[PDB]
Design a protein around this ligand. Structure first.
Ligand code: HDD
Ligand code: HDD
Ligand code: HDD
Ligand SMILES: [Ca+2]
Ligand SMILES: [Ca+2]
Ligand SMILES: [Ca+2]
Ligand SMILES: [Ca+2]
Ligand SMILES: [Ca+2]
Ligand SMILES: [Ca+2]
Lengths: 671, 318, 673
């Protein structure tokens, strides 16, 4: 692997310059002990020049993100549907690198911003790198790539003051959404729990666009990629996400790092929906339109293989920051479609790496290199790392015997465009009328959510739209929301003191679709990695004993246990001062600690009780092991996801069911 | 003051960068459901610009915000310095100031616990003069060659890039405990000075001893201190943590709003002035940036008024 | 190759993208067979994006040049004078890369411009890369690095029109030389045959500055580097250089390439002059002044080892274009001096690689990498190729157990500044008065040239100064020249229609120094690689037979033989149409071809012109076969002339002709004032 060959070990040895001369780097060379620094101090200048040039431009979008290595394993020989080599045998393994991300925030912004999320996967295949550059939401805001700067300018901070960071909760974003109705579908997804996933491991990945699978015989079918999480679907609640943004901006990257280090590497079934070319317009919308899903009722999923992430990077900058994905990284057996969003992306990702890398040889960085030989006549450019032996790099040649040879459908396993593809008509800058229904699918999505999930979505819209200053923009927003659902418009309008426009039923319907609801997706299939905070005290030996008993049990079940007390000592992981309910998926108070919940210079006033109360409010399983604590927290003892047992084994059993349930949604008020 | 470079787009038809009227909402395609054409120059110029919008963030002080204003001299300071911007009572010079944290990237929170930058440009009639200062008067290290060591240790661990905008991790405290020069700045950063209430409620310091040089060639040693007219104020830590989540833009918004409401912040630009002969007279070396001159030993002299009163037009450009 | 690990072979296989996907690259993807090209054609865009970005900025100076790989071998353990590891044992070998260059011309300018030449050597030592970034002239134009942009702006093309290319023959250059008298010494060198060397192999290399050798015990001595050519010293004559610039702009790079391919890799003795620190001002000038040489009469050369170039690059761009030299690439055992020209260079070469490479990781390019491990806390930056395992890259640390460890005089073989070095005094932007004699050494140099060599130098000045349009600049030039030599000023003034100023004898003297004259350096020590053109005809089978016999006899001795005739056929290398006297070091006509001395196959009079040009330019010329009068008379070449040969016997002809090739130039053919 190119990555192994380029690893540099500094566990031993004397300091050297970049050209191998042993040096020092701690004191400048001066004319006298209290004198000025000398220009001839090359040790100083090489070190400081490197430092001065460490930074590269952040990605234009998805600047905030984190990555990991893993493997993809095929379930079968898929030759019957695609020529793709990485899919050509049962058990065939291909290395992968995945980067997850938000979209709008800059590289130091919070993981738990409300946003669309990226899910970009590189398959280092035996016939070239293949990238699926996806998102955690299956539909996109816009229908033509030329509009991308308009969307992104509108959601990013206002350009006079660069406010607000990593948020759509401002006038410009809602101005764009209300003027560009294509945005409605993705907007509803982003305003649902999909905008604030519990982790990268608890979200799905989607290619968004229709692509083609192409067989060696030249025939093609239309596909959608869906990476289905084996960890389950889970979200934060909004208030929890806001607190998290402050308490731990690195929450998702830490969660991923930790899951991998503990041997709990996340998995996805890599799936496709597969339909015939003749079905491009058969489902009541156009498969070229990236604002539309194919409901699973119309086309089921085929599981192709397993994606597992199981190794963290060695150097974040070299691997995660420098990975340069492209939908143009395609392999024989896959083709594009005429989706005008996809079409323009192909241009952007090749171009933008020039900005990031500062030169044209970015595919030579170890993380971007393939795992097969490269034979082409690309030459020179800044940062050229190869020494090419072929002195006749032109085609056609005789002086290099005609090498490299052209690869195509009938030679060298070449990529080829699906041969059934055609174009016909005027050369036009016109939108297909088949793209015109911007509201029915947002309504389908909304209908498919549970009542509390609908409330959360309404509440996300109430929150953001109430921060829009322009009365005109707010009225225009209600106009668009009303075209999706009158009830949504009414409920949002109520928070902002405006009147909703009269019902417009053109696009209203009562249809639902499977697989889009988080709340309705049932209990989590595993609770491994979930976090339990045990709130204890150093003042009672019994409290620490209770905590240790709980820890032993919970840890064998794969839970990450944090014992919290006033001060650190053996068995205590965290002080009350640094602890917060956002750090846990479940909270347990050991009954010996009751007095803390009734002042200390060691933590802020009321901190122990606030952790328990916040956890309860945010829907988490909470309990007391060993009435007074529940009374102080105003937590009803008979509440769903509230536990009270003297028996540790009984408590652990019940609490673990609570962790799988994950959120107790009956704690949230409904319109 | 940058009016000559402003571009107005409150009217008119869309053009390319070379003035040709164009559109930018639909790609050119071979048929209404067809593939996009390479000859679509409207598409490519717009997307190429977007693709190249970003530039590297600053290596340190990446997170920050700025404003325009004016400096006004209180006197003719010719008797201590030849500096033209200080050569007459009431003399005005335009300024631009940027405030910042140190460790966090772009988009990190304003209310992280950190040292803060306070960088001032005076656009003087004899050249631009910059005082690139911090809100804490002493620095962590005693030799510039150690800067990458300090900064690597406080910035996120380089395998996972965790944690953002924080000294609360092993590497930073490893460095602090192995490099004892860091103790003074550390104590400042752990005080309320690490979490100021606003940019307007902190002071600015040049940190280093500089020289004032008269036209006759004589010199004196100086320290710069910009003393806030708004007062000194801090957040409490638990409040700062919540603010980092509820409003990452808190300090930049506070500054923007104070200027828009006609409450532009002010500082007295001051110096401590001492003789060359006093370089080692105070029980420490004035060449050592980890030391302050206590005010009991050398009082502040007020040179003039710094007022920030105009927000930028384009954040990126300015 | 030393860089074998980075080589990419394309002698087999199918075309791929840069990420290994097999593709084609000959036809664009179109909407229909006569349709528009598609944006989704990634094959097209990746190929054309690479092409669009192939170029990098040329070097700010020395843009035109060529390089080769080789080996340095030490002649002894030099620990008595230096701690340097590459010099620490008899027979110790270190790989090298050398680049030679002109100074002023851009890429693609002619090799045979009149100029100073670069001679830059990298030693990939077992204690780090060590570069000696030298020139073929031992003194520099200016005494302070801050003046470099002034010098270079003045010699490079005028910035309104970018004229003239690769030439000092214009007003601005001579304005600068006349206003900045420090320039006189290098100017005299550049106007000598040293400005137009016969090849890179026939010039010497100089470090120019005084450096220090530092022993492990901390003691230091002052040194000058001198790489002495084992091929001999040789120059072109100016007219020949001008024709060559047009007929073969690649002359020097071709000569080097070919010498290496034929197993005649060029060699130099790497030498130093060594003197004590106490001698910094003992020789009548300041050793910190880069406009002065130490005459060999005062300090002899010590031979340290052998430098041999014996392997050409595989990819010119990757190796020769991307090599990034720095005098900051120094190793334990060597140190700087307070020469203000050297001092500023240290800054420039680190900074300029950011422009060339576009990013800070230029030491990672294969040609710039060291041959030993790198242990440091440098990180990130565009184009970062390493994956660093150490996640605590700060000092002092405990979390990486205090590694990397600091290296210094007493631990880890660290570089250390010579510990006897001191500074004292005011912080000043003032020139030392010890630097003020700008004229005595130019006169020493001029005095050391032979009479015809002095004439060539005067003639170079007459040529260039006659092209200066400003009469004030011309007068100012004569004022400066006159301070070196009244006779030079008078002889130059004569060509430009001005009067020389009255003699000013302040700096005049009659002293001479050894080893700076080309004309006086004696016959070449080897004639291997020298070029012999044999002018023949296809009209006479006998002429081709003569040429074949001569070829065999000359090739036996390592000469490169070209047989020229009207048209190509077996045994004939070049047509008269492509042939020129500048392609040869000696020219022989076979007597069977005497009739040639009009056709649609070459320009009128071309065969005779080759012979006449060769004679005029001082080369050995001759007629082989016994009948010489017809050819020699047509050429107006005297049959008894030195370096003119005529013999029936091929053996006897070649024996005489080879002596002429070693003499190299017959200077009796040039008129003197
Ligand atoms: C026409 C421009 C354009 C359009 C319409 C899109 N993008 Fe994009 N995308 C870019 C232009 C771009 C970019 C500017 O080229 C980025 C920035 C960094 C990079 O490599 O490409 C990028 C980055 C980027 C990343 C981050 C990859 C990483 O982790 O390094 C993801 C996951 C996506 N995009 C996903 C999408 C999806 C799912 C889209 C709609 C289906 C989409 N993009 C439309
Ligand atoms: C040797 C390196 C080095 C050292 C020792 C310091 N800095 Fe610095 N500083 C930089 C290298 C640097 C830099 C890498 O050059 C930056 C990044 C962006 C820039 O323009 O310069 C910078 C940025 C920077 C900024 C941001 C200016 C802006 O808003 O754009 C401030 C306020 C400071 N620094 C202040 C200080 C103070 C008060 C220091 C100690 C007295 C200090 N720096 C030591
Ligand atoms: C302060 C500026 C400055 C000064 C005073 C000099 N140079 Fe230099 N030199 C450069 C600034 C520079 C440079 C701009 O940094 C170059 C351009 C390309 C490079 O790598 O460095 C360079 C290139 C360069 C090269 C080409 C190296 C190669 O083949 O790539 C040679 C041989 C020299 N120089 C030699 C000299 C000598 C013998 C000097 C006087 C003793 C000298 N330079 C003074
Ligand atoms: Ca806005
Ligand atoms: Ca939810
Ligand atoms: Ca750490
Ligand atoms: Ca305080
Ligand atoms: Ca000129
Ligand atoms: Ca030293």
């Amino acid at each position: 692997s190119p990555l192994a060959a380029y690893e540099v070990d500094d566990s031993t040895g004397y300091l050297t310059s970049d050209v191998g001369g042993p040096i020092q780097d701690q004191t400048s060379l001066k004319a006298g002990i209290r004198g000025p620094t000398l220009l001839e101090d090359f040790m100083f200048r090489q070190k400081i020049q490197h430092f001065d040039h460490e930074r590269v431009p952040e990605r234009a979008v998805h600047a905030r993100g984190a990555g990991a290595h893993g493997t993809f394993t095929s379930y079968a020989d898929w030759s019957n549907i695609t020529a793709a080599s990485f899919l050509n045998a049962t058990g065939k393994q291909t290395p992968v690198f995945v980067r997850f991300s938000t979209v709008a925030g800059s590289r130091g912004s919070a993981d738990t911003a409300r946003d669309v999320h990226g899910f970009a996967t590189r398959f280092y295949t035996d016939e070239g790198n293949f990238d699926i550059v996806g998102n955690n939401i299956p539909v996109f805001f816009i229908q033509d790539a030329i509009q991308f700067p308009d969307l992104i300018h509108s959601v990013k901070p206002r350009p006079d003051n660069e406010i607000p960071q990593a948020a759509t909760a401002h006038d410009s974003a809602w101005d764009f959404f209300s003027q560009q109705p294509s945005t409605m579908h993705t907007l509803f997804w982003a305003m649902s729990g999909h905008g604030i996933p519990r982790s990268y491991r608890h979200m799905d990945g989607f290619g968004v666009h229709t692509f083609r699978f192409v067989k060696d015989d030249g025939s093609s079918k239309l596909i959608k990629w869906h990476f289905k999480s084996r960890q389950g679907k889970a979200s934060l609640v909004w208030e929890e996400a806001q607190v998290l943004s402050g308490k731990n901006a690195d929450f998702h990257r830490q969660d991923l790092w930790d899951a991998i280090e503990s041997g709990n590497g996340p998995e996805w079934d890599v799936c496709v929906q597969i339909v015939d070319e003749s079905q491009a317009q058969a489902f009541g919308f156009d498969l070229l339109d990236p604002t539309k899903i194919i409901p699973e009722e119309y086309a089921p999923l085929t599981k192709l293989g397993l994606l597992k992430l199981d190794r963290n990077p060695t150097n974040y900058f070299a691997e995660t920051e420098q990975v340069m994905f492209q939908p143009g990284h395609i392999v024989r057996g896959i083709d594009f479609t005429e989706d005008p969003l996809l079409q323009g992306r192909l241009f952007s990702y090749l171009d933008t790496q020039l900005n990031r890398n500062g030169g044209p040889n970015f595919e030579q960085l170890p993380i971007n290199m393939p795992r097969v030989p490269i034979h082409n006549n690309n030459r020179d450019g800044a940062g050229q790392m190869f020494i090419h032996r072929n002195k006749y790099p032109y085609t056609p040649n005789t002086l290099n015997s005609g090498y490299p040879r052209q690869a195509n459908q009938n030679a060298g396993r070449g990529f080829f465009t699906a041969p059934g593809r055609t174009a016909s008509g005027a050369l036009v800058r016109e939108v297909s009328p088949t793209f015109n229904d911007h509201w029915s699918q947002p309504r389908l999505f909304f209908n498919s959510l549970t009542p509390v999930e609908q409330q959360f979505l309404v509440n996300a819209m109430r929150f953001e739209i109430s921060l829009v200053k322009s009365e005109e923009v707010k009225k225009n927003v209600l106009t668009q929301l009303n075209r999706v659902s009158h009830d949504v418009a009414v409920r949002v309008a109520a928070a902002i003191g405006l009147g909703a426009p009269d019902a417009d039923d053109t696009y209203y319907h009562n249809n639902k679709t499977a697989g889009v609801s988080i709340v309705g997706s049932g209990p989590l299939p595993t609770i491994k990695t979930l976090r339990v905070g045990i709130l204890a005290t150093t003042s009672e030996s019994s409290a620490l004993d209770q905590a240790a008993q709980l820890r032993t049990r919970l840890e064998k079940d794969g839970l990450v246990v944090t014992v919290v007390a006033e001060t650190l000592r053996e068995g205590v992981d965290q002080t009350y001062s640094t602890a917060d309910a956002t750090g846990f998926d479940g909270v347990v108070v050991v009954d010996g600690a009751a007095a803390l919940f009734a002042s200390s210079p060691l933590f802020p006033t009321g901190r122990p009780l606030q952790i328990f109360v916040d956890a309860y409010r945010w829907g988490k399983p909470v309990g007391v092991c060993g009435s007074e604590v529940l009374d102080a927290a105003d937590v009803p003892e008979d509440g769903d996801g509230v536990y009270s047992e003297e028996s540790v084994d009984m408590f652990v059993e019940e609490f673990e069911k609570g962790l799988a349930t994950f959120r107790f949604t009956d704690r949230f008020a409904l319109d």
